[PDB]
Amino acid sequence: KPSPLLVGREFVRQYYTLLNQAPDMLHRFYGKNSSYVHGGLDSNGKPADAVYGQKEIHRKVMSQNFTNCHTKIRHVDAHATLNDGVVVQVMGLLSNNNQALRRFMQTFVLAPEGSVANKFYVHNDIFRYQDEVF
Amino acid sequence: KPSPLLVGREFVRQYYTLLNQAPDMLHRFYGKNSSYVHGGLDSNGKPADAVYGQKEIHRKVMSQNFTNCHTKIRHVDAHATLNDGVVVQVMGLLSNNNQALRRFMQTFVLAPEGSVANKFYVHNDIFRYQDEVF
Amino acid sequence: KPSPLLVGREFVRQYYTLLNQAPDMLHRFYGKNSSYVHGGLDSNGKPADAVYGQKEIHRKVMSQNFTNCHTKIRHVDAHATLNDGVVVQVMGLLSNNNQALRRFMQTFVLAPEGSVANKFYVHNDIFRYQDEVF
Amino acid sequence: MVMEKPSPLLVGREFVRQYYTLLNQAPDMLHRFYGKNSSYVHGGLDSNGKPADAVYGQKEIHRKVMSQNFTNCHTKIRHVDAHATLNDGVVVQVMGLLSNNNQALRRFMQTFVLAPEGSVANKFYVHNDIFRYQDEVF
Amino acid sequence: MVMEKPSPLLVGREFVRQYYTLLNQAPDMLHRFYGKNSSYVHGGLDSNGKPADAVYGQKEIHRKVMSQNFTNCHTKIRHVDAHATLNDGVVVQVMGLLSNNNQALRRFMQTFVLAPEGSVANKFYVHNDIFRYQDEVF
Amino acid sequence: KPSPLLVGREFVRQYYTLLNQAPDMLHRFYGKNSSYVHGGLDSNGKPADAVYGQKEIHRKVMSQNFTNCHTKIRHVDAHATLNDGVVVQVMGLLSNNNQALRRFMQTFVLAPEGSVANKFYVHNDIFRYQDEVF
Amino acid sequence: KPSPLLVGREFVRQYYTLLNQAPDMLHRFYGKNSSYVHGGLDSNGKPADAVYGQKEIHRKVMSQNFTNCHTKIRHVDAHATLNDGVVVQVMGLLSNNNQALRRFMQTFVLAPEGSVANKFYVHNDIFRYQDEVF
Amino acid sequence: KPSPLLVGREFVRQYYTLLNQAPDMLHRFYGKNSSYVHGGLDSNGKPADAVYGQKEIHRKVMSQNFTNCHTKIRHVDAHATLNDGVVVQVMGLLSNNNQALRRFMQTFVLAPEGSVANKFYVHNDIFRYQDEVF
Amino acid sequence: KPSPLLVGREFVRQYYTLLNQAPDMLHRFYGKNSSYVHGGLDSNGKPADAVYGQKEIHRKVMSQNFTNCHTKIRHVDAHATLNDGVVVQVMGLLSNNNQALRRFMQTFVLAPEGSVANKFYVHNDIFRYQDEVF
Amino acid sequence: KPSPLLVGREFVRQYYTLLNQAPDMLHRFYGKNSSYVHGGLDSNGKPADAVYGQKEIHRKVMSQNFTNCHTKIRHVDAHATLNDGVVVQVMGLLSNNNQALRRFMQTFVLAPEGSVANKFYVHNDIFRYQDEVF
Amino acid sequence: MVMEKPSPLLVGREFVRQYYTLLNQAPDMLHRFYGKNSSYVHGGLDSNGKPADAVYGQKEIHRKVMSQNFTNCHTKIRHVDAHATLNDGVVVQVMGLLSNNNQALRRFMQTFVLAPEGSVANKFYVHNDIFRYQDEVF
Amino acid sequence: KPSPLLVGREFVRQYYTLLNQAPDMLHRFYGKNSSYVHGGLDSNGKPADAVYGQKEIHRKVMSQNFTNCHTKIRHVDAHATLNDGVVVQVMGLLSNNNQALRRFMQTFVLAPEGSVANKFYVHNDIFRYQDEVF
Amino acid sequence: MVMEKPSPLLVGREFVRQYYTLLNQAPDMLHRFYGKNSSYVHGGLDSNGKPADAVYGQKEIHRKVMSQNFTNCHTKIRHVDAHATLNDGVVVQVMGLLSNNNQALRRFMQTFVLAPEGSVANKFYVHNDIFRYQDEVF
Amino acid sequence: PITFGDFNDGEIESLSSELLTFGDFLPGEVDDLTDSD
Amino acid sequence: PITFGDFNDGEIESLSSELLTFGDFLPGEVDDLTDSD
Amino acid sequence: PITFGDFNDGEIESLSSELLTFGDFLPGEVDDLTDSDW
Amino acid sequence: PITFGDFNDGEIESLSSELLTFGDFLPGEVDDLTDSDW
Amino acid sequence: PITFGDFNDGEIESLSSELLTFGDFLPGEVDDLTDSD
Amino acid sequence: PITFGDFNDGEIESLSSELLTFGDFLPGEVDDLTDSD
């Protein structure tokens, strides 16, 4: 029974290490009923919708083609949630392809597997850049 | 059963209208053992801690001293999470006492009542500004 | 061939219902080469420039930024115009962002799309307050 | 010296000016502004408490304008907004003050829908006229 | 970690919150906010149609607040603006809605002038309190 | 020693008379270190920082550019404050640029100049409108 | 005799108030054989010719179609001239029918009435915009 | 002996607490040969020079008008120097008269008195606002 | 004996020219137990550990790797301090490897050799950027 | 009266010496109504805007912002103009911000101030890098 | 139709054009550009490794300009900058390329100081002319 | 299978030929993962921002204003690199807009498309003027 | 403590530092920077006047670096620009001054292409090295 | 079946959820507090 | 004698010219037309 | 005992150690009275 | 034993534990060689 | 005494202060390093 | 057959017209005038 705050901090550390160390390895963090948004746009101008399923999450990650992503974490706030879950709020700056950093907004929902102790998986993940909304 | 997007949009509308009109009546949105971290600054300058319980949530809401809270909702995302709950990410502007609008997010986690069907209560509430982190 | 008065009441009810609930979908009422003119957004707020097209109408609606806009319709007049069109002159009280009830008048000109019977789209939409003119 | 067709805003404002000046001076000639299929309300209030219905015709429009028999009425237009609409016509939204037979200043709401005459270019007639006072509605 | 002292806006808002919460809870204890030379008027109306006058001393404010029932009143503050003024004090201007004994909410106009006590740092008392509902005025 | 009520009425009359006739000489009422806040002047119109000093007060007054701003005073309360000062609360109707009558609060705090008896200057000048709040 | 500057200030205020309120009553300010060149570009783009006499001035003012003429007066200069007249140069912003404010000058020459002392009539009026020239 | 970083942090805390709470007590920090600059502009816009001596330092502090100064400290870096003195580098934001916060750059030099243990006095003090230089 | 301002100006010119030309050769500006601080981020991110001793400053400068380090001095202040030393506050812009100019300050404390007159060695050197603390 | 060649040599030596040491005091060479053009950078580097007066010359010099600008004068010609003035044409190599040698020409027109004999001020100062043209 | 006596930049450019066109076409006529107290240097190089000195006077200006033979010379002016100066004069700074008798494009470096004649308005003569090639200096 | 040296010379010739004739087609040489840096102009020419993609590369070329850019290539070195690619490093004299011969380095990294044999595209394109650095 | 892998610019600059410090300290160890398929040319001139060719292997790398036998050479790097390229490698473009065996500094012009080793993460070797002086080219 | 634009029959009717309530608020209670009060 | 700021006794009383009329408007007729009505 | 200037031990903290209060209410009574409500 | 996303304990630390090196130099070898110079 | 502007004879010559050195640098050797190359 | 990008066999070689002249200039006179002269 670890502290949600430390659980969220360690999860964000691992997630943003794996984002650039191995972007194609990111799908292992999610599960069956898992959502995913990473701040996309289209012709209509509306932000991109979510995708569900591990395969769809992996395909979306490869489409977004994260290369050498650099992340500065300005804030992490983790709290307890149903089924001993953890809700994580992430405030930071993200830069893709070594380009200009953009302020980014992130909400993780991590749920226990229920089979292994302290085993968490990313049930939900929402991401959005500041410039694309404000 | 309604869509998570519908639930999130309706809850965002009701919550951010009640915040402007009757901030003292905002404590009825939460239930027992519910998180509320609508802060950001404390004596040491670090992000504020959490208050749990309806009494503590009401006390902290009164402490915030909401006066004609004008909200400006730039974006709302709603997804279905574990235990039939709904996770909402809200981005926008907030102005308290008719001051300058400050950019913010708010993460809601809404849990479903076991007894009453189609009933939700705010299990988790997280609020953050830009100027307190960036 | 429905009664123009009945079409006017139906349109006013649906239009303000969707306006109160989900502002992002207001452009769904409008089609192509349709005119939308409102109170006006500028550094001074004086010059109100109309916009045309679904994309520009949606952009303008998002920029002018409806949120929990309560409308009390004092009066609606519906009449028959050219090409079997409808003209709706509406007087009411509008409160956007939970401001006070402000007197407003709004004129719709609706034309049938032709493909589907009993189907109308906003060809002209002129909105105006009383505080900024009178 | 390019001979440009008038902008819809110009047509709307010019129509408002002529309409209200002629209404102030010679209401008897006002009926000629409307065509055969002309719908019209002007601050109506029947003996029930509800706003009066619309009327639908030139000769009847003449009967109406003699019914309210404006004399030396004063009009002060505060806003005019004209836009293009179907069949080349212009939709005009008008707001201001009107006092008939030297009563107090009353706010009013007016919407105009004009249609081309078809035979002569740049010729319009009042297809739709909606006018209601603010006190009779609010 | 710098202790600092509260900004005048912070003092004004904090005072407004305490004053109105104590008014809603224990109106009898409202008199402790004032001093020996405190002027106070709370939405009065004499038997002439003109607004009533003000009291000028702790005992008179206590008498007045006992005069009006002031019980279980609900207040919703829409605007608070506080500025520094003479002798380190804070002038506070308040706008909102008040409803005493569960009547309809009526808009009110309020101005607060606070004064440091001097004996104790960061301690203030209500030197001037002007309050009138904008229904007996407009 | 003039009555606080008497000086309040004298000042309210003289100040609004000069404000109606020649706005450029409004700053003559104020001295040094005096605070002046009036309405809201910004891109959104909500925030308006108070200005201090005769130069800044005159600049703000010119920026606002009062022109035939007619005032109908409905109520004036004058009371005695510290340093033999005067506090003047004014309720009235203001119409700038020949617009409609708008309800307004004004709050003057006047301090004696000391050099001349029965001499006062506007130490504090708070202005608020009706439409801005509620 | 009142100072030329005060006469100019008062006349500017009265004229630009009557222009907004009662444009049809503006013809009373002028007298017999008085110039009035307020207007835009002609068919060939040349400046409009003058109109002389009360009837012609009224006809030109009515044709100008001054509806809700909002003025924003930046500068007024008034100087004494020949025959005890006053020449006023006015610069400001004008907006007819709530459109965008346009920069303008307007030169008045006010001649004293021979019969009634302390009374002036507008012998000359020369109005022009900026975009029509620059 | 205590750590130079610790004594520098303590001095910064005390100095700014005094600078807000009791500005007229600030001269007691400085000594006979102390210098003082606080970012003044005069003549050709060149920054203001320094003043020396306790009396001149007090006069400059009084003339600079410090009222309810709010200071946010973003960086403090203290190091050992000659005669066990401490050099302090301060980065932050300062707001005077509750106005807009301005970025500020500061350098303190603190020297031991000589006889009283752990007793330091401000030998040198340099202050500069960012907008006045950059 | 030269003026402290002259000493500061000359040292700033020499040091910031040698930084561009021969960064590896900078180690002879310091001496025994001299504090060098110039650095960026660490595990904590805010502070940078100081390096003492000629070998340590040389190692730290080599780690810094200045390549065509273009400086841009906006302001220099120089004041006398204890034991004839000079404290210099430098504000300006820095650009390493022809990148974007970044705002910075640098505090120097120069102490005199007793052996040679007009012989100053950098006892203290502190460097900081605006973007790294703001 | 001294030889114009001697005046030219003295002025070129002294002017470039002060340029190398303290750029801020360059304006001291110039007086009133004196013209100064140097290179040029407004939006693209082509527009060379002349500046006049000591204040504007000092502002331009501070914007051009030399830092250890080095100069190697290859040739100087001095001749006698009207009003006993001197014309000095200088060709040389300039290196600003420790950059590479760049060919340049600088033309001075120096006038005697009359009050003091053998006293001259830079009436005209035209600088131009050879590389910008050709 | 404001006369608007020419700006110093215009005078400088016009003078440069005329001077160099006349030099290219009829260089024997170049001496009339200079007055009695005119200083002249044109790419001098004495037999010592140092640039040659100046010539002060119109007659010897003509002598030296004939001394340097000028046949079908080609000039391409790449910069002219003229500014007003004392005694209503104009100071002109000029750069370009000059080739005499068809040699290579030599990069030259020139400064002009003009003086009003005084007898007739808008009349100027070359008071000072400094001209050196880049090769002979760098 | 061609020689790396041979393809290097062929590509350098063709690339500068197209650059001289029709710069607007330069983007046809690049793909979607291509990186392009060339000179730089953000504030004073120092910040060079990389661009990626054909659209961004074309926009950058149009902003970089190639018109009649004459290139005298002094040296070309072509070598074999990863994925059977080539690396070209060329030194030359470039004159854009008919300026003077300026020394420059240009480094291409060319990758085979794979679809067609003996086909290459500019994967990396680094341009740098020698004068702006040295 | 997010463990981000080094950016291409960071790894390029770090490699440049290490390369030009080890070149000054121990040139004999310079060959260990290259691999089996490493192509390297370092500002050579053959006995013809044309720039020398490049060697294509670690052993010939060692033989070449012993051939120009750098001793206490001074290097001053003025520009380094590194970009990520194909196969995760980094292409580096470097310009500065180099003086070998204590002669005057010579302007040089260099291009680096590095490749991952494959076995150990974040390990690179100099696949391609092109170096020429501006004296031998211009 | 009167619809406007490309709106299906009852699309915004389904978009409007009258029985969706949060906390212990009764249906329409929030509107009641924030309407004419 | 009570004045505010730096105004003298009756400064803006002298500034206010009630008998200043323009055109054929009677004294104060323009104001009476403007206010109320 | 680190002190600066000529101030005594903790003079600055003593001077600045005072919470914001109104009237006769020592800091806390108002919160006590509002604690009665839910 | 705190692990996430079906990753073995310390799978990420082990993966990212490597340092930036060039050639066959051990981490710090170049620094050791240049340490000889003063 | 040829001087320019408001400079006195020797003002900026004294401002030069060639004798000032820092660290263990010999007088002028820093200039020697930077100016040569 | 060696091409780059998306160019065909001598696409820009055929695009580059060497015999296109304007005015009295010979086919290359402008190039020769600009180059080295």
GROMACS .gro file of N, CA and C in nm, chain F residues 49-100:
model
  156
  727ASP      N    1  -0.632   4.799  -1.369
  727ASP     CA    2  -0.549   4.836  -1.255
  727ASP      C    3  -0.564   4.984  -1.223
  728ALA      N    4  -0.571   5.016  -1.094
  728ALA     CA    5  -0.579   5.154  -1.052
  728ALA      C    6  -0.449   5.228  -1.083
  729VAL      N    7  -0.460   5.358  -1.107
  729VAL     CA    8  -0.346   5.442  -1.138
  729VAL      C    9  -0.323   5.538  -1.023
  730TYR      N   10  -0.198   5.580  -1.007
  730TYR     CA   11  -0.158   5.668  -0.897
  730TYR      C   12  -0.081   5.786  -0.953
  731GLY      N   13  -0.103   5.903  -0.893
  731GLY     CA   14  -0.036   6.023  -0.939
  731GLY      C   15  -0.120   6.104  -1.035
  732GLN      N   16  -0.096   6.235  -1.036
  732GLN     CA   17  -0.174   6.324  -1.121
  732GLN      C   18  -0.154   6.292  -1.269
  733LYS      N   19  -0.030   6.264  -1.309
  733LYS     CA   20  -0.002   6.235  -1.449
  733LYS      C   21  -0.075   6.109  -1.495
  734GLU      N   22  -0.066   6.001  -1.417
  734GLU     CA   23  -0.132   5.877  -1.455
  734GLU      C   24  -0.284   5.891  -1.450
  735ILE      N   25  -0.336   5.967  -1.353
  735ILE     CA   26  -0.480   5.989  -1.346
  735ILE      C   27  -0.529   6.065  -1.468
  736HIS      N   28  -0.457   6.170  -1.508
  736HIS     CA   29  -0.494   6.245  -1.627
  736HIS      C   30  -0.485   6.159  -1.752
  737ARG      N   31  -0.381   6.075  -1.761
  737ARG     CA   32  -0.368   5.987  -1.876
  737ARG      C   33  -0.483   5.888  -1.883
  738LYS      N   34  -0.523   5.831  -1.769
  738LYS     CA   35  -0.635   5.738  -1.767
  738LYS      C   36  -0.765   5.808  -1.805
  739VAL      N   37  -0.785   5.930  -1.755
  739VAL     CA   38  -0.906   6.006  -1.788
  739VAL      C   39  -0.911   6.035  -1.938
  740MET      N   40  -0.798   6.075  -1.996
  740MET     CA   41  -0.794   6.101  -2.140
  740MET      C   42  -0.816   5.974  -2.220
  741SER      N   43  -0.759   5.863  -2.173
  741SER     CA   44  -0.779   5.732  -2.241
  741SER      C   45  -0.928   5.701  -2.244
  742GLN      N   46  -0.996   5.718  -2.131
  742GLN     CA   47  -1.140   5.696  -2.126
  742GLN      C   48  -1.215   5.795  -2.215
  743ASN      N   49  -1.165   5.919  -2.223
  743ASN     CA   50  -1.216   6.021  -2.315
  743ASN      C   51  -1.365   6.048  -2.291
  744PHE      N   52  -1.395   6.101  -2.173
  744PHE     CA   53  -1.531   6.142  -2.141
  744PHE      C   54  -1.576   6.252  -2.237
  745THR      N   55  -1.699   6.240  -2.288
  745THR     CA   56  -1.754   6.339  -2.379
  745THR      C   57  -1.904   6.349  -2.354
  746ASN      N   58  -1.948   6.465  -2.304
  746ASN     CA   59  -2.087   6.488  -2.267
  746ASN      C   60  -2.139   6.377  -2.176
  747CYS      N   61  -2.054   6.334  -2.083
  747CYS     CA   62  -2.095   6.231  -1.989
  747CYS      C   63  -2.186   6.290  -1.883
  748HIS      N   64  -2.316   6.271  -1.900
  748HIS     CA   65  -2.414   6.330  -1.811
  748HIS      C   66  -2.443   6.238  -1.693
  749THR      N   67  -2.457   6.298  -1.575
  749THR     CA   68  -2.475   6.224  -1.451
  749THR      C   69  -2.600   6.274  -1.380
  750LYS      N   70  -2.683   6.180  -1.336
  750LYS     CA   71  -2.799   6.209  -1.252
  750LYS      C   72  -2.776   6.141  -1.118
  751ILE      N   73  -2.752   6.220  -1.014
  751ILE     CA   74  -2.715   6.167  -0.884
  751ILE      C   75  -2.841   6.128  -0.808
  752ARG      N   76  -2.855   6.000  -0.777
  752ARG     CA   77  -2.970   5.954  -0.699
  752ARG      C   78  -2.945   5.959  -0.549
  753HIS      N   79  -2.821   5.936  -0.504
  753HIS     CA   80  -2.797   5.943  -0.360
  753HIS      C   81  -2.651   5.975  -0.332
  754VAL      N   82  -2.629   6.046  -0.221
  754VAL     CA   83  -2.495   6.082  -0.175
  754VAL      C   84  -2.491   6.072  -0.024
  755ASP      N   85  -2.396   5.995   0.029
  755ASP     CA   86  -2.372   5.984   0.172
  755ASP      C   87  -2.231   6.032   0.203
  756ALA      N   88  -2.218   6.120   0.302
  756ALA     CA   89  -2.089   6.173   0.341
  756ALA      C   90  -2.068   6.149   0.490
  757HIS      N   91  -1.949   6.099   0.525
  757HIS     CA   92  -1.917   6.067   0.664
  757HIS      C   93  -1.774   6.110   0.694
  758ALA      N   94  -1.744   6.120   0.823
  758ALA     CA   95  -1.612   6.162   0.869
  758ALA      C   96  -1.521   6.042   0.890
  759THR      N   97  -1.397   6.057   0.844
  759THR     CA   98  -1.299   5.947   0.858
  759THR      C   99  -1.174   5.997   0.930
  760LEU      N  100  -1.065   5.922   0.922
  760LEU     CA  101  -0.940   5.953   0.989
  760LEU      C  102  -0.873   6.076   0.929
  761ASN      N  103  -0.787   6.139   1.009
  761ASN     CA  104  -0.718   6.262   0.972
  761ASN      C  105  -0.817   6.371   0.931
  762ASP      N  106  -0.933   6.373   0.997
  762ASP     CA  107  -1.040   6.471   0.963
  762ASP      C  108  -1.072   6.460   0.813
  763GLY      N  109  -1.079   6.336   0.762
  763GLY     CA  110  -1.110   6.316   0.622
  763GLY      C  111  -1.259   6.298   0.599
  764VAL      N  112  -1.295   6.289   0.471
  764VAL     CA  113  -1.433   6.270   0.430
  764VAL      C  114  -1.443   6.146   0.342
  765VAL      N  115  -1.546   6.066   0.365
  765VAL     CA  116  -1.578   5.953   0.278
  765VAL      C  117  -1.714   5.980   0.216
  766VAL      N  118  -1.721   5.972   0.083
  766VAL     CA  119  -1.840   6.009   0.009
  766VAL      C  120  -1.877   5.892  -0.081
  767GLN      N  121  -1.993   5.831  -0.050
  767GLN     CA  122  -2.046   5.720  -0.133
  767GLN      C  123  -2.157   5.780  -0.219
  768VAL      N  124  -2.153   5.757  -0.350
  768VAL     CA  125  -2.246   5.817  -0.444
  768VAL      C  126  -2.309   5.708  -0.529
  769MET      N  127  -2.442   5.712  -0.540
  769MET     CA  128  -2.518   5.627  -0.630
  769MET      C  129  -2.579   5.716  -0.738
  770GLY      N  130  -2.565   5.675  -0.863
  770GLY     CA  131  -2.621   5.759  -0.967
  770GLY      C  132  -2.636   5.687  -1.099
  771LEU      N  133  -2.676   5.764  -1.199
  771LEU     CA  134  -2.688   5.719  -1.337
  771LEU      C  135  -2.588   5.797  -1.421
  772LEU      N  136  -2.503   5.725  -1.494
  772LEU     CA  137  -2.404   5.786  -1.582
  772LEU      C  138  -2.435   5.749  -1.726
  773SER      N  139  -2.420   5.847  -1.816
  773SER     CA  140  -2.439   5.826  -1.959
  773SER      C  141  -2.325   5.895  -2.032
  774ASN      N  142  -2.231   5.816  -2.084
  774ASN     CA  143  -2.117   5.866  -2.158
  774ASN      C  144  -2.141   5.850  -2.307
  775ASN      N  145  -2.090   5.945  -2.386
  775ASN     CA  146  -2.106   5.945  -2.531
  775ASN      C  147  -2.254   5.944  -2.570
  776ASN      N  148  -2.336   6.012  -2.491
  776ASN     CA  149  -2.480   6.024  -2.515
  776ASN      C  150  -2.546   5.886  -2.524
  777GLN      N  151  -2.501   5.793  -2.442
  777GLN     CA  152  -2.557   5.659  -2.438
  777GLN      C  153  -2.666   5.652  -2.332
  778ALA      N  154  -2.712   5.531  -2.301
  778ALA     CA  155  -2.820   5.512  -2.205
  778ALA      C  156  -2.770   5.533  -2.062
   0.00000   0.00000   0.00000
